[PDB]
Design a protein around this ligand. Structure first.
Ligand SMILES: *Cc1c(COP(=O)(O)O)cnc(C)c1O
Ligand SMILES: *Cc1c(COP(=O)(O)O)cnc(C)c1O
Lengths: 491, 489
């Protein structure tokens, strides 16, 4: 297996990076030999949409292509001030931060492997080799996929990733499998395409393998109006919005069912590196130790090559950058890339060169992992504050909650039936709108559990992130919400 | 009508720009009052696809609009605390108004700097804190105001409810209007010779393309009418096409630019057959001075620009695909669409469940250059410069052709706009096209084969004069002339 200490050698022993405009690359330029001793992935021809199968590809002097001259790109230099690994706080970066300059002629001047003229011009649909090498190495270091022909493709984000895998696998009048309570934007992306959602139940630890098996085993084309679904959308770590994180045992169990029913697993994992210690009343010995500490992903267990892993920089570095990637078997990744060519094309070149300078040249794999440890330490303090505030202010007779292990979401259950629903407007939805609107008026924003339902009126929940608000404000916000609850649940 | 000198006062008398994280806006917050006196666009309910009709407002993005009310604390949308973005300052060195050459910007360039806490320090209306966080599908209000103003000045559209929406690019724009206005089985209308990328974006959606004959000035109205009128008796198993894809200026790959008279003839035909006109205009500012063998001011420069389809859009049936690619940087992955509120809202919906918005890092760098430094003046100055650069490059390739290409078998008109030179050769004369491609590559010149661009007749070759040096432009043409002479004896 590839370790941080093996990367300098892998690069020495592998082909040079092409530093000209929009060069052909793949992950295969960057993968370690070990990868090719593993078996090949299963084929998925039968699962490709008619749209997706239809998609196709587009020393001498060239007057051939429509690439403009960098002369008429009016950016000579792009600089960013970034934290130097010791200190990662805004105060520390101001104090001791490093300035990274990307110049035109950087490649001629031997300064950089990513020229601003190249970053400012058109790119390929897989993204720059400069950034794809880091993403590929990162994928190998963290997940180490157990099949030979895995590949990364850079993205305009997981939102675009999900839209374009939905188009790749699904047709008008198909079902896909989601968790009881899922990401609203994921469902929001699926419906307009004619894709229906068959929900599968979950516990405090997330997706239940029994329910998944039960839905797929008990599937009748006639009643549902469509064929057995073969796509599973799931958030394994810090589930949106429950915050439930599957342990290794649940994931192995889920993978078995997917093997039996021949499912493609789409793991959307934005908070994968936000795994914290379990909450208590009130450190990683090495980078190998930190990586070992992370509960393994579906990609890690992906013996069959049936997994698409949606990764993003949004919850790790910046949602603004609109930069992510997909990890999957060559055949599906190749299909995704064609959709990018006639769509988003690639994430912004300025986004790519700023990320590459920080991740590749400055931080490296060490500095990046150092930053994710700090992000783990940060979100831990915030996780404690929201749970401490919840039980010190919230009415325990009306509100119930499990403290979360990973993510930035807190799931609060509300006994909606312990409020005067005997007379007048006895609609669970009515108490919901009331409880939400009563919260803004006492000055707190929360997410309505009903937005996250994949589709039944039982208990009601509220989603409360501990990422959005200043650490000091976390306590004040829950109190404000506690007050709202008491008022609304009163005379 | 809105002019550059009208802008400072439109701003003074308008609402404050929202400097918060992921704020709600629309062009309707930056459009001058004159717009609202004009009539409204026609309704497009009957042209909206099942997919697009079916789309809905993002409940999270919609809930973010709550972040506006002050002293309100958020446990809602998962937009991270700025402390978890490791970019303190982002700086960019760009040219001053007098000199735009890379060498001139090296010597006299300005360094614009975007820092976290700039909006609290009163340095700019765009905080890096905001740029680096999630944004709404329309793009940042700071960048959207500039593009909306720019759209008013240049095109100043003749209907009330026109709107702009920021973009991942014109390629992403075309992807989303095709899904918004087309279903499996339908036809769309494209020029006989057209952008290969535009045709490839449509084929896998099950959309067929109805070709329409061109001349030296582009799309022919009598051919468009003929195709659509003939649809009544000769349907191709599908309903009459209502979408026209058109590149009016420096058309790819012909280089044919429709003049105002030609755009007026086409538009009248688009009224008769109630067509929606999608005008892909990436080379609109690559318009050059006429070929032989100085735009006094901004006010003169805008006079000399051929009016776009949007400028004649009285019905509101025009969707304009704009991009910064051929004027600032293709790498920026930042464009926009202009159209009636109805289709732009549907466009915006799909963006929310798609690309979402152009990179915030792309947006703050474009806004800082365009709004804070150059201004509309500086940008027009830069566009005039661009005009003059491409003029010189157009000259170079045409001069070469007139000096090397054999008139016996080679025919060519000079381009008025864009970066493409379109060469016509008579195949019958030589002792069939594959033999002309490879032969020329044998002399070490590469050109693009016309057959690659079909949506019979004479054979053509597209030669771009955008990138290569004045030296290599001649050389390359000379290498072609000799290869053609060898193939045709
Ligand atoms: C926040 C979030 C996203 C956002 O992805 P981008 O890369 O920012 O487009 C996607 N999926 C889930 C589950 C999220 O929570
Ligand atoms: C170059 C070009 C574009 C540019 O598209 P973006 O995705 O905005 O870069 C669009 N249309 C045509 C016809 C082009 O030639």
């Amino acid at each position: 297996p590839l370790t941080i200490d093996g990367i300098a050698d892998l690069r020495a022993k592998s082909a040079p990076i092409p530093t000209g405009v929009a060069p052909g690359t793949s992950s295969d330029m960057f993968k370690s030999p070990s990868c090719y001793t593993k078996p090949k992935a299963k084929r998925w021809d039968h699962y490709l949409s008619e749209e997706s199968k239809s998609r196709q590809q587009s020393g001498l002097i060239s007057l051939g292509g429509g690439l403009p001259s960098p002369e008429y790109f009016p950016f000579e230099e792009i600089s960013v001030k970034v934290p130097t690994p010791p200190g990662f706080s805004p105060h520390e970066t101001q104090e001791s931060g490093a300035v990274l300059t990307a110049k035109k002629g950087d490649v001629q001047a031997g300064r950089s492997l990513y020229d601003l003229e190249v970053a400012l011009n058109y790119g390929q649909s897989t993204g720059s080799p400069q950034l794809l090498r880091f993403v590929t190495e990162h994928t190998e270091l963290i997940h180490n996929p157990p099949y030979a022909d895995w590949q990364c493709c850079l993205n305009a984000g997981s939102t675009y990733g999900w839209d374009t895998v939905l188009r790749m696998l699904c047709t008008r009048g198909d079902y896909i499998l989601m968790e009881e309570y899922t990401f609203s934007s994921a469902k929001e992306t699926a419906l307009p395409l004619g894709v229906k959602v068959a929900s599968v139940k979950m516990d405090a630890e997330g997706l239940l393998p029994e329910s998944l098996d039960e839905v797929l085993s008990n599937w009748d084309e006639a009643s549902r109006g469509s064929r057995k679904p073969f796509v599973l959308y799931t958030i394994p770590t810090g589930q949106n919005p429950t915050g439930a994180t599957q342990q290794l045992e649940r994931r192995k169990a889920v993978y078995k069912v997917a093997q039996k029913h021949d499912l493609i697993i789409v793991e959307d994992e934005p908070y994968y590196f936000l795994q914290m210690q379990p909450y208590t009343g009130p450190p990683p010995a090495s980078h190998d130790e930190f990586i070992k500490s992370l509960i393994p992903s579906y990609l890690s267990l992906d013996v069959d090559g049936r997994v698409l892993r949606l990764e993003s920089f949004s919850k790790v570095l910046s949602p603004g950058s609109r930069t992510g990637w997909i990890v999957g078997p060559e055949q599906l990744v190749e299909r995704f890339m064609r959709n990018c060519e006639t769509g988003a094309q690639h994430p912004s070149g300025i986004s790519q060169i700023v990320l590459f300078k920080l991740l590749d040249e400055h931080w490296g794999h060490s500095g990046y992992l150092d930053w994710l440890i700090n992000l783990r330490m940060q979100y831990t303090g915030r996780r404690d504050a929201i749970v401490n505030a919840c039980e010190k202010y919230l009415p325990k007779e009306i509100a119930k909650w499990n403290p979360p292990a990973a993510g930035m979401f807190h799931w609060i259950e509300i006994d909606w039936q312990k409020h005067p629903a005997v007379a007048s407007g006895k609609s669970r939805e009515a108490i919901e709108e009331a409880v939400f609107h009563a919260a803004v008026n006492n000055g707190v924003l929360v997410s309505r559990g009903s937005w996250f339902t994949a589709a039944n009126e039982g208990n009601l929940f509220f989603r409360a992130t501990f990422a959005a608000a200043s650490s000091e404000n976390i306590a004040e916000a829950i109190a404000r919400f506690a007050t709202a609850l008491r008022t609304e649940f009163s005379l």
